[PDB]
Design a protein around this ligand. Structure first.
Ligand SMILES: O=c1[nH]c(=O)c2ncn([C@@H]3O[C@H](CO)[C@@H](O)[C@H]3O)c2[nH]1
Ligand SMILES: O=c1[nH]c(=O)c2ncn([C@@H]3O[C@H](CO)[C@@H](O)[C@H]3O)c2[nH]1
Ligand SMILES: [Zn+2]
Ligand SMILES: [Zn+2]
Lengths: 157, 157
């Protein structure tokens, strides 16, 4: 189940790059193996630097379910969520995060060294409790490949 | 100017809680003494847990200015921005942050013990060189009293 939804997030990333919506990032929120939201980065489309894939997916899942908390839901991010997105994931009460590529994969192609301490376990004032899985094997390979494949197909932000 | 725009943020907090839009939080984004956006928490109105005052202000200012970077602007937050909002302030390239009350004043009335490591300089990975001013004296006292003054007027989220 994990690989399917992670691959869908990666496809969202590729799609958003292709249509010019934003950068190569995708996010899928699921409820017991039913997709509640499927999104990619919309910063360029919306002129909104907060419209990362994860924040967009959280907003859409919360509208779909008509509530502000997603405690029964899990999120799949093609790349390690940034500090803003990890904070948003905390506020939304999502119970589990699965992510594909480490943030260094995005940094290597020109994005900010902008890494969430609370996700990596080095936070002091921010302590996450949600379950977190870094993908291995084929999932990690696909997710990492995203940034090589899309290298100069999009405008950096 | 700092007292004026901090007071505007505080009044936005009271306004939002009085109209039921969200919690007692306000944020004002200013461009060389010209207010670009003046917003409050909209989590309840929008059914959106990311719609904190600061994120709302950033969204509105970016849409109004037709740019995703606010590097000529400053943000005034009635309360110390949370991890998500501090991430958003970083991503938006705002050049200065002035905030009124410490996060503990909001935590005292039941909000999450959820504090931005990068703002307090306690991170391993996430650093900030953003210019950050915590207000003192006058506006700061007024800003601190917001949460005791409003805590029976809204539902925690
Ligand atoms: O979580 C994220 N969602 C995005 O859409 C996105 N777009 C760009 N970035 C940046 O990639 C780096 C690694 O997380 C950080 O500089 C992010 O801001 C993003 N991070
Ligand atoms: O920056 C913020 N903007 C808000 O609108 C807001 N509404 C609630 N909170 C919570 O208040 C505490 C102190 O920052 C944290 O638990 C925030 O999530 C907020 N933080
Ligand atoms: Zn993000
Ligand atoms: Zn916030």
């Amino acid at each position: 189940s994990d690989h399917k939804f992670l691959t869908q997030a990666v496809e969202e990333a590729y799609k958003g790059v292709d249509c010019g919506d934003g950068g190569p990032f995708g996010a899928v929120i699921v409820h017991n193996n039913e997709v509640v939201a499927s999104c990619h980065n919309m910063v360029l489309k919306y002129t909104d630097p907060t419209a990362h894939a994860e924040v967009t997916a959280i907003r859409e899942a919360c509208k779909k379910l008509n509530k502000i908390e997603l405690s029964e839901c899990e999120i799949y991010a093609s790349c390690e969520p940034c500090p803003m997105c990890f904070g948003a994931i905390h506020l939304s009460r999502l119970k589990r995060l699965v992510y594909g590529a480490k943030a260094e994969a995005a940094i290597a192609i020109g994005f900010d060294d902008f890494i969430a301490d609370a996700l990596r376990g080095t936070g002091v004032y921010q302590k996450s409790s949600l379950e977190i899985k870094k993908a291995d094997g084929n999932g990690a390979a696909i997710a990492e490949q995203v940034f090589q494949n899309t290298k100069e197909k999009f405008r950096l932000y």
